[PDB]
Write a protein that binds this ligand. Structure first.
Ligand SMILES: [Mg+2]
Ligand SMILES: [Zn+2]
Ligand SMILES: [Zn+2]
Ligand SMILES: [Zn+2]
Lengths: 541, 97, 119, 67, 40, 537, 191, 83
């Protein structure tokens, strides 16, 4: 038989940011590219094959499905591919991190060079239960500041100078800076070796003499592995997870992004379609990586090797390297100019019958709306008190009320059905002007179905919108659920926001021609009569 | 409120906000993500700016509480109903042994 | 799903039988009304478990449990012999463990058949 | 901002909380910790953009209803 | 598989160290049998 | 996908996966969790282990620390503060993990150590004695001898017991060894500073003068505590036999065991030099000088280097003075060597004139074996025979010709022994990969480019030694993890194979997995014999 | 037939709020604990009673009421199993299968642990005992020896197309036994 | 995690405008899923409108759990809260 399948509603409680290690890139990967550059254009339909965008990754067209998950461009999440490169290359984003983690290490024993008592005091200072993010950066600054005071090492007799960037992406290690008159034995070996190699060639290498120590990214990849791993707690990294490891900040596997992320722009239906430059950059990475892996053992290396390897470093640095605007796109909204209407109430905006026919509202049928929704379905989409779509309870499809499905469709109307009715009188709608200054720029209103196609509204409410009408456009949004529709009419609508919160004064009140109409009635020289007072009392209500 | 007067600038939003995605809504990007991934921020989601990114309900305003529905059932119905179940196995298990 | 106590409250077969009997009187009957995907096992357990009483005990069950309390044996085999009814054979020996003896033959026969045939 | 704009169903796992495709984890190949939930689509593009480079924004989940 | 670069010299079966492996596995069995196990 | 080439554990864990796999196969799985946090963090208290394991309680953490302390797998350290609150702190002990690492070579060297009484006692008695010593930890005599019933041969253990602790291995228990190396120096460094009263400045400190001599003095006394001591040895009762006091308990010393294992590589170098007989007389002359030799690095410079130039200079100079002045190890005369005339004296002159640095510095006529001038040749003669064995002899030529001078340049290698542009570059790049070239650049431009720059190749030491040591520890961590792969395929076989104390498909399963379980130990012993040289200075 | 006490949380939709709480929770627990074999507990049948219910909590998404309960669902699982009644299903020269009909038909018993004086023939005759042999549809009182659970084998999604173009197999609740008693195996062998 | 009993409630006994809109929207979302109402409503539609009739009568079967920032549940039934 079958088994108990249990589910629990879960939610996100954190974001543990980390770096992908060498195993985690290969594990989530699908295929390796493995030396393909020409995109495999055989003369059938110019298709795609391995080493590039392919069905092993996602899709970028209507046909030619993925066959890892059988879906079109709308139903494929995308997949990754790993890219192993020989001579592991330096990471451009972790440049400052590599410099700060190389300043805190000895270059001989590959261990930390802070004293084991001050290590104990600063380590006890780190594990306080109340530590702010601005405080812990200061404690790590104190770590790197006190760590630039021990010239020798506590486990070996080697001396540490200073390490910085060669003023390129080259890490230089200027040694012998703290060494003065007191010559080290390693300084004696230095003098003897350089005197010997200048005795061999006293022609070229005499002018260049300040060339002490360099850090090869292949060499510091092998230097980050000799950690005691009890020292990977004062350097910022917390090495309790196997995704710790300062070695994992050097490129050994490049995660190729999915082709759903890589844009195939819709300036096409023309033959010989063009892609963007990101797949071209991946191709140009793969070509020089295979060129290094091939020419490592096949001839003229060293100048071409280091030139192409630094060119690969600049290529990876260019690959991930090169704004607070509107952004989000919202369904069920409109934008129309505005017009005067004081016959409309202050809590209403009159919506015309041409945009209150496509802006629908989803209503679930229940015991208290079966008498209305049947006639609403029968009236159809062209008659304004009507509906457009219909969703069944058992989820057959989203059947529209346009192609067939006459009178008999309203006859059944099972109790879980969801119709999409037209906008009617009394529906909660929110109403916006695009340069929104403060919180009185988005109010909520009731709807009213009218003639000619403008968003007319009362003028007692135009003062918070800063309306000077003269052909200005405004936006209109309808909520699409039962809970957000209540949070607009109760604490967001017009009648509950007669004040401004800036000072407490009434910001939304009587306006221009309603003031001079009150100064002329309440003027002292005005005396009325029952042929006039009755008409005045009947024109106000 | 932190013991130092630091305003609202590039170096000013780092006063208390541990939220990386809240600090990613500012200019000069591509440098706050890498040190957050290097120093391995735990980054518990609590601010409203990273609840609208993940689609979570905010803990201020309307979502500052919860409503629950009462069952209104008594303890007379929640009884361990029992009539001659363990009487057979209790007496003939500790007699003369 | 997370269990709390696995082996709790070892109940007999007739208790399950009377529970499923009293479960089908809350709604329409299974046999009287014969003339959602749950009544199947409800009518299949009550049909299969009543196959040994072919060709019923509340106070007789009390006298039977006192008679099982009169002499001592192991724990669950009392439940096994109060459910399987070993009467017209030597199947009681088949219940209690090896060594066919504990007590002699003219006593195992009567302490088998009177107890397992009175119920 | 979410339902009417970029509502997008996805599945994320509990242990080593990355995301897969509707039945499978793609990292832990046994794939029994799959939890299905909804997320904005721009957050999905942000997660894959961070995961394309060497950043792992791991999602830590918890149940809503505990006590 | 992927490693094809050559192998070191410590792999014949011309050993004559069969007693050492027996001492190894008997030490392992006597430590596993001991009171200080604390497994799982 | 098909990850089968061991990639999901490949790079994620060196230097602690070895320590977690040596204790998983011996002390359960709960000890692996509390030993994987002492290594990954360092010092953390009892409550810190409880809040860092996330799955064990105080009743579970404190129980497993006793099982590690009994095998001396955890160092103790108690501390205090300026306001009090004395608590207990735990360090990871690498000596106990090394005891769990070798574990059969301890009971291999101790068998081939005794004299004429051979193969009648040293297979049943002492093979259980030393195995109970290593397994149970600290052992006393009275609690152990009560296991045998009707001990008629109760004096046979005492003859092997008084002899074995006289010349080595057995030693008084860890009343000193659970203390760390750092705090034993730091508590001794502060008690000889605050107990000096106020005086004149005299270059403003002056007490770093006194505190760098006298503390070292009684530090040596602490170093004098785990040695041959007459407090337990040569106790003389009346009208009886010479016997040691069986009252206090006793354990093994991992300091004399390692210097006797160093003699194996010394015999291997002697067999590299000379063939049969002269190597044998060097063998017996070294085996007669084992228990009094200077040892693998003392705790004086294990930690606490206070950046002093004179200390780092004349620490290896005073070690030479320790080498020169022994109570009898320098006495390496002819009749003393032959007791356990001119022919072996001529062979010893061949040792003196062998000119690789062993058996030198013989000014009056009495010979001596130096060690500190022997350790770089010992560590380098085995490094040159691994690249020559695995990677190739041309790689050994291209690596050792870097060492012929200091920094041979690219137009000088191709002038030596092989032409250019064919396989010197591939071999040289492969040796760049294994940290034995250490390239350097000089530029001809303003930003240190690659086109206008030429290179310089110097083989830097202590970068090839540390990487190969880490690689050997890594492959040791490999070789015991694949042993745990056959345990999951024999969990339903070895558990059932205990009631016997045919189904012939089991004959190709049970007796087929046995040699695959023994050859990994037969190779692990050779891993041990190849790895030891990089941790003996 | 044990009384296992487990605890989970269930949902009640708003269109079933008109009933009382006990019958609603009991109806929502029966859709989950029908013929719905539990991982390593056995097969549940019905719900005995429910206890220590809590307040019905609700998230802003659904609108239904979520109640965490603690009930005592009856699970058909013998603790070791000694003697149980169930008749035969189909003759096979392997571990022979029986039917405890009405609940499930999955119980095997291996022939190698029975009497060694039997032989199966391909001429439709069953195992012949050292008198007459047994036939179809007759009550068999047999032994219970081994009962080992396998809960869920998940299936990879690109593997899910190699099993749908051309065309469950492991049972989640299987039992074994070993008949040893002289005369046991058929009802009419006695009397 | 501890629940404050009825005699130890320390918050305000009034109904906030933030907890008036959420209880009304939750009641209107329950009524739209065919829940039985408990008011004599005139024949109409829009569950947000007939939930206001229940709020004006105070016959909503909910309570408003008010969380303090350590876990201090403090039940606060709706009919106890006045408008
Ligand atoms: Mg204007
Ligand atoms: Zn796909
Ligand atoms: Zn160092
Ligand atoms: Zn996962």
């Amino acid at each position: 038989k079958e088994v108990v399948v249990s589910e629990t509603p879960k939610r996100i409680k954190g974001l543990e940011f980390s770096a992908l290690s060498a195993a985690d890139i290969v594990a989530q990967s699908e295929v390796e590219v493995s030396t393909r550059d020409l995109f495999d254009l055989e003369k059938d339909r110019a298709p795609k094959a391995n080493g590039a965008l392919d069905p092993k990754m996602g899709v970028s067209s209507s046909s030619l499905e993925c066959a890892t998950c059988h879906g079109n461009l709308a139903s494929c999440h995308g997949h990754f591919g790993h890219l192993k490169l020989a001579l592991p290359v330096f990471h451009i984003g972790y440049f400052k991190a590599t410099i700060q983690i190389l300043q805190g290490i000895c270059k001989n024993c590959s261990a930390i060079l802070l004293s084991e008592t001050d290590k104990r005091q600063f380590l006890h200072e780190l594990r306080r239960p109340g530590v702010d993010n601005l405080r812990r950066m200061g404690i790590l600054k104190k770590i790197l500041d006190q760590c630039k005071k021990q010239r020798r090492c506590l486990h070996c007799g080697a001396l540490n100078g200073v390490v910085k960037k060669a003023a390129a992406l080259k890490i230089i290690h200027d040694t012998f800076r703290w060494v003065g008159k007191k010559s080290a034995p390693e300084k004696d070996i230095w003098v003897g070796e350089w005197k010997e190699v200048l005795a061999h060639n006293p022609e070229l290498e005499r002018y260049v003499k300040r060339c002490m120590d360099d850090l090869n990214p292949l060499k510091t990849l092998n230097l980050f592995k000799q950690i005691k791993s009890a020292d990977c707690e004062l350097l910022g990294i917390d090495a309790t997870v196997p995704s710790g490891r300062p070695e994992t900040y050097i490129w050994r596997y490049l995660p190729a992004p999915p082709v759903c992320i890589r844009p195939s722009v819709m300036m096409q239906d023309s033959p010989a379609s063009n892609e963007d430059d990101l797949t071209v950059k991946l191709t140009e990475i793969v070509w020089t990586s295979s060129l290094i892996k091939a020419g490592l053992d096949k001839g003229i290396s060293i100048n071409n090797m280091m030139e192409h390897w630094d060119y690969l470093q600049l290529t990876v640095a260019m690959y991930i390297n090169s704004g607070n605007l509107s952004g989000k796109r919202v369904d069920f909204s409109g934008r129309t100019v505005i017009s005067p209407d004081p016959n409309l109430s202050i809590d209403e905006v009159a919506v015309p019958d041409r945009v209150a026919k496509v802006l629908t509202y989803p209503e679930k049928v229940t015991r208290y709306n079966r008498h209305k929704l049947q006639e609403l379905i029968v009236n159809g989409p062209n008659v304004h008190p009507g509906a457009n779509y219909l969703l069944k309870r058992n989820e057959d499809a989203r059947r529209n009320l346009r192609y067939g499905d006459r009178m008999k469709l309203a006859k059944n109307l099972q109790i879980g059905d969801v119709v999409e009715r037209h906008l009617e009188d009394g529906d909660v709608v929110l109403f916006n002007r695009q340069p929104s200054l403060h919180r009185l720029s988005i109010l909520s209103h009731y709807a009213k179905i009218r003639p000619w196609r403008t968003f007319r509204l009362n003028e007692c409410v135009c003062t918070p919108y800063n309306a000077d009408f003269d052909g200005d456009e405004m936006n209109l949004h309808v909520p699409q659920t039962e809970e957000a529709r209540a949070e607009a009419i109760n604490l967001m609508g017009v009648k509950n926001n007669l004040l401004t919160p800036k000072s407490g004064e009434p910001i939304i009140a009587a306006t221009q021609d309603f003031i001079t109409g009150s100064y002329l009635i309440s003027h002292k020289d005005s005396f009325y009569d029952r042929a006039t007072l009755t008409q005045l009392l009947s024109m106000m209500s | 409120y932190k013991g130092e007067v630091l305003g609202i600038t590039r170096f000013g939003l780092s006063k208390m906000r541990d939220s990386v995605l809240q600090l990613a809504s500012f200019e000069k990007t591509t440098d706050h993500l890498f040190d957050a991934a290097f120093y391995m921020k735990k980054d518990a989601v609590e601010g409203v700016s990273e609840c609208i990114i993940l689609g979570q309900t905010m803990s201020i305003g309307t979502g500052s509480f919860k409503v629950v529905k009462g069952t209104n059932i008594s303890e007379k119905d929640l009884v361990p109903k029992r009539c001659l179940f363990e009487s057979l196995s209790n007496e003939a298990a500790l007699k003369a042994n | 799903m997370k269990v709390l106590e696995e082996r709790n409250a070892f109940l007999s077969d007739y208790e399950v039988l009377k529970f499923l009997t009293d479960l089908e009187k809350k709604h329409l009957w299974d046999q009287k009304s014969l003339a959602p995907e749950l009544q199947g096992i409800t009518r299949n357990v009550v049909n299969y478990l009543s196959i040994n009483k072919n060709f019923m005990s509340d106070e007789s069950f009390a006298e039977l449990m006192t008679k099982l309390n009169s002499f001592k044996l192991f724990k669950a085999e009392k439940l096994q012999i109060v459910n399987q009814l070993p009467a017209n054979m030597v199947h009681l020996y088949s219940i209690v463990e090896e060594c066919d003896a504990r007590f002699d033959e003219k006593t195992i026969e009567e302490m088998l058949e009177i107890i397992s045939g009175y119920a | 901002l979410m339902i009417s704009s970029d509502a997008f169903e996805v599945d994320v796992c509990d242990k080593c909380g990355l995301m897969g495709y509707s039945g499978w984890c793609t990292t832990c190949k046994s794939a029994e910790n799959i939890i299905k939930m909804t997320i904005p689509y721009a957050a999905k593009l942000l997660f894959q953009e961070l995961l394309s480079m060497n950043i792992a924004p791991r999602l830590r989940l918890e149940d809503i209803f505990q006590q | 598989e992927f490693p094809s670069i050559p192998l070191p010299i410590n792999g014949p079966i011309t050993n004559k160290e069969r007693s050492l492996a027996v001492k190894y596995i008997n030490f392992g069995k006597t430590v596993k049998d001991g009171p200080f196990y604390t497994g799982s | 996908v098909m990850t089968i080439s061991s990639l999901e554990q490949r790079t994620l864990n060196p230097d602690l996966f070895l320590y977690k796999e040596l204790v998983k196969a011996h002390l359960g799985e709960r000890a692996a969790s509390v030993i994987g946090m002492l290594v990954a963090l360092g010092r953390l208290s009892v409550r810190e282990l409880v809040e860092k394991i996330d799955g064990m309680d105080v009743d579970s953490v404190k129980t497993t620390l006793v099982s590690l302390t009994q095998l001396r797998c955890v160092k103790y350290l108690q501390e205090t503060a300026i306001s009090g609150k004395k608590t207990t702190y735990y360090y990871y002990n690498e000596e106990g993990i090394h005891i769990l690492l070798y574990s059969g070579l301890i009971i291999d060297e101790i068998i081939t150590q005794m004299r004429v009484n051979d193969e009648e006692e040293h297979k049943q008695l002492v093979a259980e004695i030393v195995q109970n010593v290593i397994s149970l930890g600290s052992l006393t005599v009275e609690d152990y001898l009560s296991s045998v019933t009707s001990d008629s041969m109760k004096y046979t253990i005492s003859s092997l017991f008084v002899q074995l602790c006289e010349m080595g291995y057995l030693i008084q228990i860890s009343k000193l060894h659970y203390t760390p190396i750092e705090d034993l120096w730091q508590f001794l460094y502060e008690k000889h500073y605050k107990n000096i009263p106020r005086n004149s400045p005299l270059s403003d400190l002056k007490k770093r003068s006194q505190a760098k001599m006298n503390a070292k003095t009684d530090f040596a006394k602490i170093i004098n505590k785990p040695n041959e001591l007459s407090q337990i040895l040569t106790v003389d009762p009346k009208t009886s036999l010479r016997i040691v006091k069986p009252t206090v308990s006793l354990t093994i010393n991992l300091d004399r065991f390692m210097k006797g294992r160093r003699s194996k590589q010394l015999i291997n170098l002697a067999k590299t030099r000379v063939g049969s007989v002269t190597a044998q007389v060097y063998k017996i002359a070294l085996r007669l000088t084992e228990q009094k030799s200077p040892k693998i690095r003392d705790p004086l410079t294990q930690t606490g280097l206070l950046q002093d130039l004179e200390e780092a200079k004349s620490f290896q100079d005073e070690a030479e003075l320790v080498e020169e002045k022994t109570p009898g190890l320098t006495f390496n005369a002819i009749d003393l060597a032959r007791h356990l005339a001119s022919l072996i004296n001529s062979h010893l002159k061949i040792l003196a004139s062998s000119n690789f640095p062993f058996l030198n510095e013989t000014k009056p006529g009495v010979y001596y074996v130096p060690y500190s001038k022997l350790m770089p040749v010992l560590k380098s003669s085995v490094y040159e025979y691994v690249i020559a064995s695995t990677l190739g002899p041309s790689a050994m030529r291209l690596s050792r010709c870097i060492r012929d001078n200091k920094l041979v340049s690219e137009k000088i290698i191709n002038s030596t022994a092989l032409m250019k542009e064919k396989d010197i570059r591939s071999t040289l790049a492969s040796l760049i990969r294994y940290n034995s070239v250490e390239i350097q650049e000089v530029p001809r431009t303003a930003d240190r480019s690659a086109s206008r720059a030429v290179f310089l190749f110097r083989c830097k030491e202590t970068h090839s030694y540390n990487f190969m040591r880490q690689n050997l520890e890594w492959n040791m961590a490999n070789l015991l993890f694949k042993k745990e792969k056959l345990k999951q395929e024999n969990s339903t076989l070895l558990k059932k194979a205990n009631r016997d104390d045919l189904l012939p498909s089991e004959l190709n399963q049970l007796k087929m997995v046995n040699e695959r379980e023994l050859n990994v130990f037969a190779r692990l012993s050779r891993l041990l014999s190849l790895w030891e040289v990089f941790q003996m200075a | 037939f044990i009384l296992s006490k487990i605890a989970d949380l269930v949902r009640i939709p708003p269109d079933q709020f008109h009933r009382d709480t006990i019958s609603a929770i009991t109806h929502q627990l029966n859709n989950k604990f029908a013929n719905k074999i539990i991982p390593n507990v056995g097969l549940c049948i019905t719900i005995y009673d429910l206890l220590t219910v809590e307040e019905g909590q609700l998230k802003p998404g659904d609108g239904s009421s979520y109640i965490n309960v603690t009930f005592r669902a009856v699970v058909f699982k013998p603790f070791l199993g000694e003697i149980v009644t169930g008749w035969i299903s189909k003759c096979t020269a392997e571990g022979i299968k029986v039917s405890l009909l009405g609940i499930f038909d999955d119980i095997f018993i291996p022939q190698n642990m029975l009497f060694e004086g039997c032989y199966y023939t391909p001429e439709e005759s069953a195992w012949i005992w050292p008198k007459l042999y047994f036939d179809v549809n007759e009550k068999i009182r047999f032994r219970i020896e081994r009962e080992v659970f396998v809960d869920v084998k998940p299936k990879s999604p690109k593997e899910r197309e190699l099993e749908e173009r051309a065309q469950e197999k492991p049972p989640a609740y299987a039992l074994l036994g070993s008949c040893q008693t002289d005369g046991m195996g058929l009802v009419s062998w006695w009397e | 995690e501890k629940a404050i009993p009825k005699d130890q409630r320390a918050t305000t006994p009034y109904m906030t405008k933030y907890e008036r809109a959420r209880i009304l929207g939750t009641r209107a979302l329950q009524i739209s899923m065919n829940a039985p109402v408990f008011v004599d409503l005139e024949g109409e539609t829009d569950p947000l409108r007939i939930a206001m009739k229940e709020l004006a009568e105070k016959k909503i079967p909910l309570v408003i759990r008010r969380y303090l920032p350590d876990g201090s549940f403090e039940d606060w039934s709706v009919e106890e809260l006045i408008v």
